[PDB]
C-alpha cells in the first residue's frame, strides 16, 4: 500500500569443515555465464548480407 517491502541480492554459504592450523580453504565458488539472442525479420529480405 505504502509499506514498501524490499527484495535482496544474497550470496550465502553455511559450511562445516575441519582444517589444519593456518591453512586456507575455499568453501564456495561460482562461474556463471549466460547469453540470449532474439531476432525478428521479414521472410526473404532479412537474409540479404549487410
Amino acid at each position: 500500500n505504502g509499506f514498501t517491502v524490499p527484495g535482496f541480492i544474497t550470496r550465502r554459504s553455511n559450511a562445516e569443515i575441519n582444517v589444519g592450523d593456518g591453512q586456507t580453504m575455499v568453501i564456495s565458488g561460482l562461474v556463471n555465464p549466460k547469453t540470449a539472442k532474439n531476432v525478428s525479420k521479414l521472410p526473404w529480405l532479412g537474409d540479404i548480407p549487410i
Binding site: 517491502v5 524490499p6 527484495g7 535482496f8 541480492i9 544474497t10 550470496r11 550465502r12 554459504s13 553455511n14 559450511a15 562445516e16 569443515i17 575441519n18 580453504m25 575455499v26 568453501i27 564456495s28 565458488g29 561460482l30 562461474v31 556463471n32 555465464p33 549466460k34 547469453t35 540470449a36 539472442k37 532474439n38 531476432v39 525478428s40 525479420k41 521479414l42 521472410p43 532479412g46
Partner: protein, 97 residues
Amino acid sequence: NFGIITGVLSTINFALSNGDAYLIANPQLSARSGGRTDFLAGGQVPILQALAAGQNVTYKDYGIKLEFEPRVDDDNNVSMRVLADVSDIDPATSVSL
C-alpha cells in the same frame, strides 16, 4: 423484398522469428565427511503468505542453490546426497495481484 448484402474481409501475415539461449553454471563446494554444506548465489523475493484468511511476509530464494551431504569409505568411495537447483524469475507467469 428479396435480396442479399454480403462481403468478405482479409488479413495478411508474414511474421518470422527465432530465439536462442545458452547457460552454464559451475558451482563448487567443500564439506567434511559426515557434515553438510549449503550454498546459495542468487536472491530472495517477498511473498505474501499467511495462516488462514482470504499479512505475513516470507521470503523465497531463487538463483543457484547447492546442498551437499557426503560420507567417505576407507577406499575413498563417496556416498552422497546432492541437491542442485537453478531457478530464474519468469515474467510470463507472474501475477500482478
